[PDB]
Amino acid sequence: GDPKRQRKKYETPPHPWIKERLDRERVLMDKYELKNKKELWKHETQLKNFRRRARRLLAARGKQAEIEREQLLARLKRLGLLPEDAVLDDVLSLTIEDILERRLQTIVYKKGLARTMRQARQLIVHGHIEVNGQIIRSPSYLVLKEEEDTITYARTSPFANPQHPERMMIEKA
Amino acid sequence: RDIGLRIQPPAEKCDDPKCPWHGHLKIHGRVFEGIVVSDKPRKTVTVERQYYHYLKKYERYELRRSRIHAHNPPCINAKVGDRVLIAETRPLSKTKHFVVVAVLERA
Amino acid sequence: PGKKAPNGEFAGRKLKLKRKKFRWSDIRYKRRVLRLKEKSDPLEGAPQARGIVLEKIAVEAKQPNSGMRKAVRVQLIKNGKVVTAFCPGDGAIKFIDEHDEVIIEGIGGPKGGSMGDIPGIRYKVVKVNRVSLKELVKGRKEKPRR
Amino acid sequence: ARKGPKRHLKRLAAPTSWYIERKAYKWAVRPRPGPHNMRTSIPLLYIVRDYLGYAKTAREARKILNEGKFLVDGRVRKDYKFPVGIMDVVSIPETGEHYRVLPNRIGKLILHPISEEEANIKPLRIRNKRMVKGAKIQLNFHDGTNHLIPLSEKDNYFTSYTVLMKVPEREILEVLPFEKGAYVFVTQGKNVARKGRIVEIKKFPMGWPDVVTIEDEEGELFDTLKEYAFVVGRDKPRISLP
Amino acid sequence: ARMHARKRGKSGSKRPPRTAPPIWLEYTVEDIENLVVKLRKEGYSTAMIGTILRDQYGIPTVKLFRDPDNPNRKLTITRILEKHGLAPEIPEDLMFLIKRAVNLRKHLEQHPKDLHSMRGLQLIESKIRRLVKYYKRKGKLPKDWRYDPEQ
Amino acid sequence: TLLDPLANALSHITNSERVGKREVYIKPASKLIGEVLRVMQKYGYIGEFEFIDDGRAGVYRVQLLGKINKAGAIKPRFPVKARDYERWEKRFLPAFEFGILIVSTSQGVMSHKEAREKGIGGRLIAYVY
Amino acid sequence: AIWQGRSLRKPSGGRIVLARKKRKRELGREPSNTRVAEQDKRKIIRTYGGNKKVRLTAAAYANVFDKSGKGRKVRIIRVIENPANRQFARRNIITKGAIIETEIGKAKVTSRPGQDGVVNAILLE
RNA sequence: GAGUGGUGGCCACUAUUAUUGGGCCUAAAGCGGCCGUAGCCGGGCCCGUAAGUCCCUGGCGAAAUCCCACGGCUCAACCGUGGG
RNA sequence: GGUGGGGUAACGGCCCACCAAGCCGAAGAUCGGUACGGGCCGUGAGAGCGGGAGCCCGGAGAUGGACACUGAGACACGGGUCC
Ligand SMILES: [Mg+2]
Ligand SMILES: [Mg+2]
Ligand SMILES: [Mg+2]
Ligand SMILES: [Mg+2]
Ligand SMILES: [Mg+2]
Ligand SMILES: [Mg+2]
Ligand SMILES: [Mg+2]
Ligand SMILES: [Mg+2]
Ligand SMILES: [Mg+2]
Ligand SMILES: [Mg+2]
Ligand SMILES: [Mg+2]
Ligand SMILES: [Mg+2]
Ligand SMILES: [Zn+2]
């Protein structure tokens, strides 16, 4: 036989030039300030996997099925994608925008640590943001609900001083 | 006398050292049941068993048959057409590895 | 014609035999299993080949097109056969000289054969004296050893 | 093995009853021939280094063993390839600790802490019994050891019985018969590590193995091979079990 | 359809559903057996005896009376003849077909060019072989019995 | 020649219902056809039916109500296990609980819903929806 | 030399192409044709696993046993017949089942001289 | 997008190999016609058996590889503990 | 295939002497072509179709063809003999 080969974690479009798909993806890329299409595609694949697990478990029965069903629900609501009282059916109504709202870049922008999406990306990359006492430099990291509130400037960053010239400009908005 | 099969021994006796009932032969392993289809050679029979094999792609069955050569003790002396019971032993010839132990239904 | 047969539950062998029998009418399957392409392929299954130029020629386009297409005769190193190869580009024929060595590959037509209005030509030139021909056509590089 | 016996053992091919990381390195210790078999034992080096953690590297583990700090069934073992198996007793006298080797609920070997008094007795399953010259009876136990008895007591011992042996003197002090109502502990198969009482015994022709039915504490019934049932008491266990 | 000609004739008998013999029938079982034996001794075939009984004595099929000896089965002409030893040795239809084939063969000796009649002979012999196979299977004929025209 | 009385009955029923017939006669009767008719009546696909005795194998008389979309036999009679009913449903039925499959089991003839409730398998013989 | 591996012919009669060399553990040895002579002669063979076989080449005495269970050591006169081979009797070859004559009568050999190194026979009545 | 093009191979496209699921009046395709051996497919009822078939339960089908949750490398790829 | 032996660590037409005519085959023998087998890998909604170098388990080989010594284990890749 053949040994293991590591595989890509995203899927490319079936047809590269469809006008409607191009328009929709361009809107998303402009709004959330991503770097390249593949990054976007990565998140799409994640969504699909969730849906594909929900479809398989609806039509199943037995002992393992219940365990996997509750595990899926717990994992989904741990990420902050579902309310606490959601049921399995609610999995099928998730959209792509729901996942993009969980990126570290977006969350930094929404919390008011930056004025613009690109500025938030630069702040993350240069290492000025700490999450639960740890510095992370991947703007695409998905933030758990339990750790969302403990996101601040790094305690050794120049921005961790309210008299910094650039921080005052950020606060001005 | 018992040899672990829990069946009736043959009516009479023989002097063959290769008879599991009256000689030194030992039986151990698989036990099959079949129909004799040839008895030309001395102390040798050919037994055929039929079964069904399942073809996964076509979800249907086909008939297959298995032929085994077995030793024929004089105390039993099976003939063509009857149901026999055979058991596995040590090698006896180039192609003989079973021995007839009982005739279930004479032809 | 009646219902497709056999349909019986215990008719596996005949059904399998029928399907195996009529699969030989498929030309794609027959060529692959009998390995017919390998038996006549001058390149012997390679994607590219190296050869030596013997002479320059020109081929007329098929009707209703008009023009002369520039090609060369190439003798292959690996087995000594002779084939015809096309030279893509505007004025690319001027960069070829007799007794040069070239690299050729498939021309990319339907069913791995010829294309366009030049049937009978199956290969195109890619390198000349270990230099990309596309560069030489565009510039950016000069043909070695004059 | 084209021309002779094998001497090595890859990590990926190690027996599935060990607690070992299979991708950390290339090689694993090939155990020496000894008391138990491959599927029910583990080399001593992994006990010293990986389980208890008294040593970090193999080299310093061998220095510990060469000084005679470890006792298996009351005897000093210095070979780092020595196999340790089911029902054995591992004793460290300098730290004053004792363990019994037992299979887990999923079939892996674990160490069960035991009292000092219980550490002097080992249960042995009578695996076979034969006649030997001078007209004596030799008993062969499940861990490969042997014992001799006179012809007078030939009716007090049969296969599948359990003998409580005092170690390291190897002196018999109790015999537990295999019968209905006896307390058993399962050592292999799907129902490994379950314990209970015998209810029924069944036999089959032509040398197929025989089966037993066991009732557990909660009153559920399950079947298993007779040779997988280890007698441990009359109606209550004589040894501590997890 | 027909075995060889593939036509679709439908003519035949339409027996009404009834279990007990009709009231206006007055013969008993013993009278019927005596009549059957008498007619057989007159030299009639099994099919013809029933025809005579139906037409002249007003007796519908004898398969309306339980067999006095064996209560599990109804009475038929062949069983009645068997009870007295007058049953045919060869089944009647096979005998009729064989008799037809013998008569036709001596015609074809004088007329070797009558090819259309020869096909009829082939079909008759095919029917004969079918019947002999069926009868061998059920044990109505000895296993060595063979049909040879040269006999 | 005649090979399968059950298939003829179901084809006759589905042919007759398409032209609005109110009753049909199934010519060669059998116990299996009676069981299938009983199961079909239980779920409301047909009206009342009765057995009529002639000297031959007997006849069935069935009342139709115009509530059948399609009915057919399954050949060959595939064996099915107690947890494999879904793929056959997808193969023969239009929705996830639309219609019934009829299964012969060692406990009788029943719809696949009852068999799945009892946790047993059998052989598929027909479908109605 | 003498190879005892497998037949090169299938039971249906087809041929077999050998797929490997001959292993050492599959070889045989020369038969030992035990002759009748004035003095005995035997040798020792080192065998698989480092074991030994005692092979007898020339025989002069024999052990003859009675139905009572008593035996006597006597010398051998000649070989009367040998069912194993058609010409062993003429050449005086002793094998299991051969008939020999001694100073106290005829006897039938019950041992294998080539494997055991001794000759044991039962007395014929 | 640190990649992006060319040539050859396999799968899909393809219900152009069709068990699920294709065709044969006029488009490729019903032997010129018939008889029949093996094979395959075979009418209704009653009794028995339990080979096929269905359910329950013992012993097996190494590890790695695949899916899920939790845990360790900043997260991940990767690795460990459990359930399949 | 049978009877009687030899040889082997061991059963066996594995090899001999003697007695018979068996054994396989259109459900494909024999012969020819191609190829180390598997866990697995690629693709597809699935049914399927194609491959099986790299990691693990099993097999075989040491320029081609034959043959031996020592040894628990070899007819031995960094041991021996002939062509
Ligand atoms: Mg295409
Ligand atoms: Mg078409
Ligand atoms: Mg025609
Ligand atoms: Mg025509
Ligand atoms: Mg029927
Ligand atoms: Mg059964
Ligand atoms: Mg595995
Ligand atoms: Mg961490
Ligand atoms: Mg994680
Ligand atoms: Mg892992
Ligand atoms: Mg292969
Ligand atoms: Mg391979
Ligand atoms: Zn006997």
Side-chain angles (χ1 to χ4, degrees):
Chain A
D2 296 316
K4 174 189 177 183
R5 316 165 173 183
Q6 301 186 6
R7 298 159 58 88
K8 287 189 187 68
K9 241 66 179 178
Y10 59 94
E11 305 172 1
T12 65
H15 194 295
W17 311 301
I18 307 292
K19 192 184 179 185
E20 164 184 353
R21 179 160 185 163
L22 290 175
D23 298 356
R24 188 175 62 252
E25 291 179 344
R26 187 150 38 201
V27 168
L28 283 178
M29 291 275 293
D30 282 4
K31 181 174 188 305
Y32 290 94
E33 296 285 352
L34 309 174
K35 185 194 175 188
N36 48 25
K37 297 300 272 292
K38 54 181 293 188
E39 179 166 10
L40 171 63
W41 291 336
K42 169 178 64 180
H43 293 297
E44 284 193 2
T45 302
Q46 292 169 343
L47 179 63
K48 291 177 185 174
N49 287 335
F50 288 138
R51 298 183 78 263
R52 286 168 188 158
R53 282 159 60 187
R55 284 161 46 182
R56 196 181 66 250
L57 292 175
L58 279 166
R61 46 195 298 180
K63 185 180 185 301
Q64 184 70 16
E66 304 167 355
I67 302 183
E68 293 209 8
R69 191 180 298 115
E70 69 175 357
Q71 285 179 353
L72 167 61
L73 281 182
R75 176 64 181 180
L76 272 186
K77 64 188 54 175
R78 182 184 185 187
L79 279 168
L81 294 166
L82 291 178
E84 280 295 334
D85 51 324
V87 296
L88 188 62
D89 171 59
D90 298 331
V91 178
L92 289 184
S93 56
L94 293 175
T95 64
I96 180 60
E97 292 81 0
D98 289 324
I99 295 185
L100 292 175
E101 289 286 337
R102 289 274 99 194
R103 289 166 52 93
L104 181 60
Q105 177 179 345
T106 304
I107 286 189
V108 165
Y109 170 66
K110 300 284 289 181
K111 255 179 172 293
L113 281 326
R115 297 175 59 97
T116 320
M117 280 281 188
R118 292 183 183 167
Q119 189 185 42
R121 189 179 184 101
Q122 167 143 320
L123 287 181
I124 293 177
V125 165
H126 286 189
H128 301 297
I129 301 295
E130 75 174 11
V131 177
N132 197 14
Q134 172 83 28
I135 291 181
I136 301 185
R137 305 211 196 108
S138 297
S140 59
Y141 168 78
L142 297 187
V143 178
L144 303 182
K145 179 195 300 178
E146 66 210 23
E147 65 193 2
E148 184 177 359
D149 59 320
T150 80
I151 294 182
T152 52
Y153 296 110
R155 62 195 63 171
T156 63
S157 177
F159 292 79
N161 170 28
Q163 306 303 326
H164 190 262
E166 191 65 29
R167 177 169 175 178
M168 295 185 301
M169 181 59 59
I170 290 182
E171 304 279 5
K172 200 171 176 181
Chain B
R1 190 173 201 278
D2 182 59
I3 62 179
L5 282 177
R6 303 175 184 175
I7 55 181
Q8 293 306 317
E12 48 186 3
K13 307 179 68 273
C14 65
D15 305 330
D16 194 322
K18 302 177 187 178
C19 170
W21 296 100
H22 320 108
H24 295 291
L25 201 63
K26 309 292 184 298
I27 58 171
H28 40 45
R30 293 282 195 258
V31 174
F32 294 113
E33 163 183 346
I35 291 276
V36 181
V37 304
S38 175
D39 55 4
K40 299 301 186 181
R42 296 173 188 166
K43 305 184 184 181
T44 300
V45 294
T46 298
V47 187
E48 171 177 342
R49 178 174 54 96
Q50 299 178 337
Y51 55 94
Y52 286 118
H53 182 256
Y54 179 72
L55 299 178
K56 183 185 171 183
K57 175 182 183 180
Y58 298 103
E59 54 200 4
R60 287 161 172 81
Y61 294 91
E62 78 178 8
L63 186 68
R64 293 183 173 182
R65 52 197 173 196
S66 163
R67 276 178 258 267
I68 296 180
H69 304 262
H71 184 75
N72 195 13
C75 68
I76 295 181
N77 185 255
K79 296 291 170 49
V80 173
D82 44 23
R83 275 200 309 164
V84 298
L85 196 71
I86 63 180
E88 179 186 346
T89 66
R90 65 173 171 87
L92 300 179
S93 76
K94 183 173 182 174
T95 60
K96 292 169 64 176
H97 307 266
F98 287 77
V99 62
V100 180
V101 298
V103 175
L104 306 183
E105 173 182 1
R106 194 74 62 165
Chain C
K3 189 181 178 181
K4 185 213 298 179
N7 192 40
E9 181 176 4
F10 298 100
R13 170 181 281 106
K14 183 67 167 58
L15 190 50
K16 188 180 183 179
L17 252 292
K18 161 190 179 185
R19 184 51 55 197
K20 188 183 74 170
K21 172 192 198 310
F22 283 121
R23 201 180 176 191
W24 284 101
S25 300
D26 184 4
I27 188 61
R28 292 191 310 271
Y29 172 80
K30 183 177 182 176
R31 295 184 60 85
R32 176 172 60 79
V33 171
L34 297 185
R35 313 180 68 175
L36 289 179
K37 178 177 181 179
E38 294 79 349
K39 197 185 172 186
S40 303
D41 186 11
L43 264 60
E44 303 177 350
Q48 301 176 323
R50 167 173 295 157
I52 294 181
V53 182
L54 299 183
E55 60 164 330
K56 312 182 183 183
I57 53 174
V59 179
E60 299 196 7
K62 284 194 63 176
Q63 296 298 326
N65 286 344
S66 299
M68 305 300 299
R69 280 74 174 90
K70 275 68 183 182
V72 301
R73 311 295 307 279
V74 177
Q75 191 180 30
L76 299 180
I77 293 184
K78 68 200 306 175
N79 53 20
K81 301 184 183 300
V82 177
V83 300
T84 301
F86 174 68
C87 296
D90 193 333
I93 193 59
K94 297 157 49 183
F95 295 97
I96 313 290
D97 291 329
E98 182 167 339
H99 298 99
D100 288 339
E101 69 167 21
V102 297
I103 292 282
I104 69 174
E105 65 180 4
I107 201 177
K111 289 192 291 183
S114 55
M115 56 81 58
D117 55 3
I118 34 175
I121 299 182
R122 304 179 182 181
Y123 310 101
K124 61 177 181 184
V125 183
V126 172
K127 290 185 183 174
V128 192
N129 290 335
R130 310 175 175 272
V131 173
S132 172
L133 179 64
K134 211 171 185 181
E135 300 300 301
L136 294 182
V137 170
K138 293 306 176 58
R140 316 173 198 169
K141 249 148 191 170
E142 319 302 325
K143 183 178 172 182
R145 52 177 292 265
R146 302 184 302 172
Chain D
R2 313 199 75 265
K3 315 297 180 185
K6 294 194 293 190
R7 319 297 299 180
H8 296 58
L9 176 62
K10 307 283 221 313
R11 294 291 282 256
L12 287 175
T16 182
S17 57
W18 300 354
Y19 269 113
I20 187 187
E21 299 185 358
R22 302 174 174 271
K23 290 187 170 183
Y25 301 95
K26 182 79 172 182
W27 298 110
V29 174
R30 164 160 282 276
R32 194 90 65 181
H36 301 84
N37 53 13
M38 288 273 296
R39 316 192 66 259
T40 61
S41 57
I42 187 174
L44 187 60
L45 175 68
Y46 293 110
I47 284 179
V48 181
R49 179 178 62 181
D50 294 65
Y51 280 55
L52 299 184
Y54 281 100
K56 179 56 179 297
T57 64
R59 179 172 304 274
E60 68 184 12
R62 283 191 261 100
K63 292 178 179 174
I64 294 306
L65 289 176
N66 282 320
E67 298 168 359
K69 301 288 181 55
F70 280 80
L71 283 302
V72 181
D73 295 358
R75 304 193 180 187
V76 174
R77 299 303 185 188
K78 294 180 171 63
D79 185 9
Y80 71 99
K81 292 186 171 191
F82 181 83
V84 183
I86 307 292
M87 294 295 180
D88 288 338
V89 176
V90 176
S91 300
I92 310 178
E94 188 158 335
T95 329
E97 38 190 344
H98 317 278
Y99 307 87
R100 189 173 296 280
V101 181
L102 288 173
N104 202 341
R105 193 58 179 88
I106 54 181
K108 297 194 169 186
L109 304 181
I110 50 96
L111 299 175
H112 181 61
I114 59 177
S115 156
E116 178 177 353
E117 303 183 9
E118 191 172 334
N120 297 285
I121 57 189
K122 179 176 180 180
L124 300 170
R125 197 181 90 97
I126 292 184
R127 188 177 163 194
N128 213 332
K129 153 185 174 185
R130 52 173 44 82
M131 291 283 309
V132 81
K133 287 185 56 179
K136 293 177 168 57
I137 301 273
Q138 191 181 47
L139 272 45
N140 321 123
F141 301 119
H142 79 280
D143 70 331
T145 54
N146 300 314
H147 199 256
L148 278 186
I149 58 176
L151 194 57
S152 315
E153 285 74 13
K154 73 167 189 177
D155 297 321
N156 302 135
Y157 306 87
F158 299 92
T159 63
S160 303
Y161 284 20
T162 298
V163 170
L164 297 185
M165 187 78 65
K166 174 183 181 60
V167 297
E169 297 78 6
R170 306 207 103 252
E171 173 184 1
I172 300 185
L173 46 83
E174 178 79 2
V175 181
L176 308 180
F178 185 96
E179 62 189 358
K180 302 190 187 303
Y183 207 87
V184 291
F185 172 85
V186 184
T187 53
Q188 288 193 43
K190 180 167 66 70
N191 296 313
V192 61
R194 301 177 74 178
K195 49 191 175 183
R197 296 167 176 269
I198 298 177
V199 170
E200 193 193 352
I201 307 179
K202 293 177 287 299
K203 295 191 172 186
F204 309 94
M206 279 300 295
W208 297 110
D210 37 2
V211 193
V212 302
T213 298
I214 303 174
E215 180 183 13
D216 67 333
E217 297 295 336
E218 285 70 13
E220 310 180 9
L221 312 188
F222 59 95
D223 299 7
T224 186
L225 289 184
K226 181 183 179 180
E227 75 185 20
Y228 288 173
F230 201 106
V231 174
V232 292
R234 306 261 177 179
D235 62 329
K236 293 194 167 186
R238 295 294 218 89
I239 55 180
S240 174
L241 300 178
Chain E
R2 300 281 75 81
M3 176 170 286
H4 297 144
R6 308 283 208 282
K7 282 299 183 64
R8 305 181 185 192
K10 294 295 176 184
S11 67
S13 55
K14 296 163 292 297
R15 171 189 55 92
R18 63 154 71 258
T19 65
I23 310 182
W24 41 264
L25 184 58
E26 295 181 4
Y27 291 87
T28 61
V29 283
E30 305 190 350
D31 315 319
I32 294 179
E33 297 199 354
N34 300 329
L35 281 177
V36 168
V37 177
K38 171 191 183 64
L39 285 177
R40 177 57 173 179
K41 284 180 180 175
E42 290 193 21
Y44 287 102
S45 169
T46 290
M48 205 61 186
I49 293 175
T51 299
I52 293 178
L53 290 182
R54 179 199 65 186
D55 283 0
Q56 184 158 314
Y57 296 89
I59 305 181
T61 189
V62 312
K63 308 162 71 174
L64 298 176
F65 303 84
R66 307 263 71 190
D67 188 358
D69 312 2
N70 191 326
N72 301 276
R73 63 181 195 174
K74 60 181 68 176
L75 207 57
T76 68
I77 289 188
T78 313
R79 298 170 182 175
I80 294 175
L81 293 180
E82 286 174 1
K83 288 173 66 172
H84 296 147
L86 287 319
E89 280 200 345
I90 307 301
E92 276 194 345
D93 45 7
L94 181 57
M95 180 268 304
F96 277 116
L97 284 181
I98 290 181
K99 187 171 305 172
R100 263 166 69 188
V102 169
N103 175 259
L104 178 53
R105 277 190 178 271
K106 85 180 191 65
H107 164 85
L108 293 174
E109 276 183 352
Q110 310 164 9
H111 302 268
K113 302 181 68 179
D114 188 359
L115 291 185
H116 282 63
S117 298
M118 181 179 301
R119 185 178 182 263
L121 177 63
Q122 299 178 352
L123 301 187
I124 291 177
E125 295 182 344
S126 296
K127 288 177 178 174
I128 289 178
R129 297 186 211 282
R130 287 172 179 251
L131 278 181
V132 73
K133 175 168 63 178
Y134 165 78
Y135 280 134
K136 276 190 193 298
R137 192 165 82 244
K138 310 300 292 186
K140 305 300 180 182
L141 289 181
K143 294 180 180 299
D144 58 323
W145 195 94
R146 293 186 173 187
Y147 166 71
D148 273 334
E150 66 180 354
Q151 175 270 352
Chain F
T1 60
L2 176 61
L3 302 170
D4 196 329
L6 181 57
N8 288 352
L10 295 181
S11 63
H12 184 19
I13 286 182
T14 179
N15 272 343
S16 298
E17 62 90 10
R18 290 211 175 101
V19 295
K21 301 284 185 179
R22 303 310 286 178
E23 64 176 357
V24 295
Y25 296 88
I26 312 303
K27 182 63 141 55
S30 57
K31 300 296 180 60
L32 189 61
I33 295 183
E35 292 301 321
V36 175
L37 290 178
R38 175 186 60 82
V39 174
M40 290 172 66
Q41 183 192 42
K42 172 188 292 193
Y43 285 85
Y45 288 106
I46 63 176
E48 59 196 3
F49 64 98
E50 58 169 331
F51 180 92
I52 302 178
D53 183 296
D54 51 5
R56 317 170 185 190
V59 184
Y60 266 117
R61 172 178 169 182
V62 183
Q63 302 290 334
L64 296 182
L65 310 175
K67 317 176 78 61
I68 291 183
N69 289 284
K70 193 172 179 57
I74 295 181
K75 297 295 298 298
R77 300 172 170 176
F78 301 103
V80 57
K81 289 186 167 58
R83 296 164 189 164
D84 269 317
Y85 287 112
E86 166 144 320
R87 61 193 195 94
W88 302 105
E89 285 187 358
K90 289 190 181 184
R91 178 157 162 180
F92 291 107
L93 304 183
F96 64 85
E97 278 187 20
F98 207 112
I100 56 174
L101 305 171
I102 302 187
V103 185
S104 171
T105 81
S106 67
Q107 301 182 22
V109 173
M110 60 182 68
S111 71
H112 74 285
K113 307 182 181 182
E114 315 172 28
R116 187 167 48 191
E117 280 304 322
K118 296 188 178 63
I120 57 178
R123 300 244 179 185
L124 303 171
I125 62 179
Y127 68 95
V128 181
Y129 72 86
Chain G
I2 312 174
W3 184 60
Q4 301 173 348
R6 64 157 57 101
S7 179
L8 293 180
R9 195 72 72 96
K10 287 194 286 185
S12 66
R15 280 192 172 181
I16 286 186
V17 185
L18 198 52
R20 66 178 190 183
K21 70 180 68 173
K22 303 174 183 177
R23 305 306 182 193
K24 182 172 189 177
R25 56 175 185 261
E26 305 174 341
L27 303 185
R29 296 195 181 94
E30 297 282 348
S32 59
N33 307 125
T34 316
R35 301 177 299 101
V36 182
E38 303 296 330
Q39 191 176 355
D40 53 354
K41 176 78 66 179
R42 52 178 57 91
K43 61 182 174 181
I44 301 180
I45 309 295
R46 189 267 194 194
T47 60
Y48 193 76
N51 299 112
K52 59 174 51 184
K53 279 177 180 172
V54 177
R55 182 147 296 168
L56 184 61
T57 51
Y61 290 84
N63 307 325
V64 185
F65 294 97
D66 188 3
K67 303 309 178 65
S68 168
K70 60 176 56 181
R72 283 167 288 177
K73 179 184 180 181
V74 307
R75 73 178 306 104
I76 306 179
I77 304 300
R78 49 176 273 268
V79 180
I80 296 178
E81 60 166 343
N82 195 338
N85 191 292
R86 199 185 45 176
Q87 63 189 39
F88 277 180
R90 174 180 71 260
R91 298 161 54 184
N92 289 330
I93 302 300
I94 305 181
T95 54
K96 181 180 184 301
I99 301 297
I100 62 177
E101 82 157 349
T102 59
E103 49 197 358
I104 71 174
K106 312 185 311 302
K108 180 181 179 185
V109 182
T110 60
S111 66
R112 307 182 68 186
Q115 307 285 316
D116 308 340
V118 298
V119 180
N120 299 340
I122 56 176
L123 193 55
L124 282 188
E125 304 178 9

